[PDB]
């Protein structure tokens, strides 16, 4: 019925945690080689997302929908460990080493991921821009739940500090949907079309992303 | 650098201070039906500055870089009062009503001035956007000190609470200036035309909107 239902209904299928890399992660199945690929190319995503806010709000001239935006990129990049830091002890926990992770070239699955947001934040909806990052940022709580989980029991992460990221994702990113999911409401220019056209995309990108391994 | 020093002397030489308006307004010759011009379409700007800010950010890759912008744009943006919020107390202190200045259209004049900055700011060199903020943002120190002593010495101001944006900008845009001008060395790629370009232009651009309210 109403678009944001809709909205929330294409992610629940669409949703990451089905995907295979997750079943197999969450079963354990997952090699060391492989958990190390994964995390290096997913650094450009890492570092580009400051940026999916940014140019939302660059465009926006609700300023109480500017304030939360804010809030948003605050706390992926203000101070330190910010989200990109925070990334990084993930990395190397992973036994990449940061010269590695400097020198890894990300793939043309990691660059479509990152094309797929940059293009809606940067596209003329900006309802649809937010409810690009509403549809990644919704599914996070339960990947980074169940993510740790699967690093404790088969990944032998026994140092919490490890994987300090996902821990701070399992919360902040319950704020960020729901203020995002107010943001749409407030963004919104006859232009619900565009809003579920962006789920769509994301979460069929997000999926092309995951399938670059398996 | 030299390219930093010829866009000192940018600004050195066409400073807000010396247009006729300000002359004007230090040596008191200014009306008060003027100042409401003036503080109404500045709003404009003033809710529009954000946005060059994080239209630089959106754009950049360098995560240094990033976060002075960030910082700037916290300085700008968030928490209450903002400098938008700051800015409304000033208009209101002025004799405006919430309700004029919310009415009020901005002038051509004023919808000029944003129109040059957020070219630079959405442009291709982000050493030139970075620029066009600092050919405005190193002025602002000591333009707020000055209009300070005008709103007290001539317009007859007692409360401090109303001019709190100029009082917060005589200090926090020394930070922004010094930091902008690390950002342009920072994002420089082989562009000091363009970083001097923006320089002219908006320098030139502020004039034009400080003769609006002249007649
Ligand atoms: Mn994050
Ligand atoms: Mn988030
Ligand atoms: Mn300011
Ligand atoms: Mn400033």
Known sequence: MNFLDQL?????????????????????????EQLQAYAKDYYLHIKAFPKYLSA?????????????????????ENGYPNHIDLWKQFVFALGVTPEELEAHEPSEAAKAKV???????????LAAGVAALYSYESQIPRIAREKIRGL???????????????????EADVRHARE??????????????????????????????LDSFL
């Open 8 to 32: 929330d209904l294409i992610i629940q299928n669409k949703h990451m945690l089905e995907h295979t890399f997750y079943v197999k992660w969450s079963k354990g199945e997952l090699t060391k």
């Open 152 to 170: 404790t029991e088969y990944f032998g992460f026994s140092n919490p500090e490890d994987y300090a990221y996902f821990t701070e994702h399992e």
């Open 180 to 209: 995002e999911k107010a943001l749409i409401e407030m963004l919104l220019k006859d232009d619900a079309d565009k809003v579920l056209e962006a789920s769509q995309e994301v979460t069929q990108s997000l999926y092309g992303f």
């Open 115 to 125: 094309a797929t947001f940059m293009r809606w934040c940067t596209g003329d909806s």
């Open 56 to 76: 939302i709000h660059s465009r926006c001239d609700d300023l109480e929908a500017r304030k939360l935006l804010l809030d948003n990129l605050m706390d992926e």
